[PDB]
């Protein structure tokens, strides 16, 4: 964990995030939806649960991106919840929830659900 | 369970469903989105898991509604997954997934998630 988590991760669709795992549970970094442009970039923040493992368990973690920067304000935020698995083919497997701000009439359509896998390659 | 499940159920928003729980695990009935009109009515089908309980456990169940009838075809289907709890204030507590048919470009926006509680009153 920690050192294994620090670095650049890529999903299937071509989004990228860069994250530092700090000593006491902190995750900080940036998410780029498209690896071309210098602002599809958004701030990310989260937490991971460091633990002694003797059985090859994953490391539980989570992070949030609010979809606002200097070029775009999409009135929404996503959370990813999942686990880090290290080794020669390290990956982070996640499920995600994306919520949009709605009126109260429309609150039943506010939250989409999906899943993502990130690899180092 | 079974006999306790058979009957009319109402959620917070005012939708209604009427269900028969058959002897070997079957749930069949109809869902009306609005209890006024004679077709906001859609077919429902599902299953429940009957079991001897000695500890006051709920009965696990699930059902599907495809949103097509003679007046409307909304190109979508919802599943509800949850449990029946009986007694003087019987309720069914559920979480749901609503999926719309999309092109492959739009498949990340295809599934909404939410929750519902049904009571007899």
């Amino acid at each position: 964990a920690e050192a294994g988590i620090t670095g650049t991760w890529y999903n299937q669709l071509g989004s990228t995030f860069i994250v530092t795992a700090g000593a006491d549970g902190a995750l900080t970094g940036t998410y780029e939806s498209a690896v071309g442009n210098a602002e599809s970039r958004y701030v990310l923040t989260g937490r991971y649960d460091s633990a002694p493992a003797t059985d090859g368990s994953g490391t539980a973690l989570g992070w949030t991106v609010a979809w606002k920067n200097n070029y775009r304000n999409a009135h929404s935020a996503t959370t990813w919840s999942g686990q880090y698995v290290g080794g020669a083919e390290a990956r982070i497997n996640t499920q995600w929830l994306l919520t949009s701000g709605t009126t109260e009439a429309n609150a039943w359509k506010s939250t989409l659900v999906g899943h993502d896998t990130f690899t180092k390659v | 369970a079974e006999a306790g499940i058979t009957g009319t159920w109402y959620n917070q928003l005012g939708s209604t469903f009427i269900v028969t729980a058959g002897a070997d695990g079957a749930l069949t009935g109809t869902y009306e989105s609005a209890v006024g009109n004679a077709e906001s009515r859609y077919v429902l089908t599902g299953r429940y898991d009957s079991a001897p309980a000695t500890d006051g456990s709920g009965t696990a169940l699930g059902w599907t509604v495809a949103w097509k009838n003679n007046y409307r075809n909304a190109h979508s289907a919802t599943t509800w997954s949850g449990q029946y709890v009986g007694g003087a204030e019987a309720r069914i507590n559920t979480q749901w997934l609503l999926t719309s048919g999309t092109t492959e470009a739009n498949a990340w926006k295809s599934t909404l998630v939410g929750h519902d509680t049904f009571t007899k009153v």
Partner: peptide, 6 residues
């Protein structure tokens, strides 16, 4: 074209 995807 939500920023998560595009």
């Amino acid at each position: 074209c939500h920023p998560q995807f595009c």
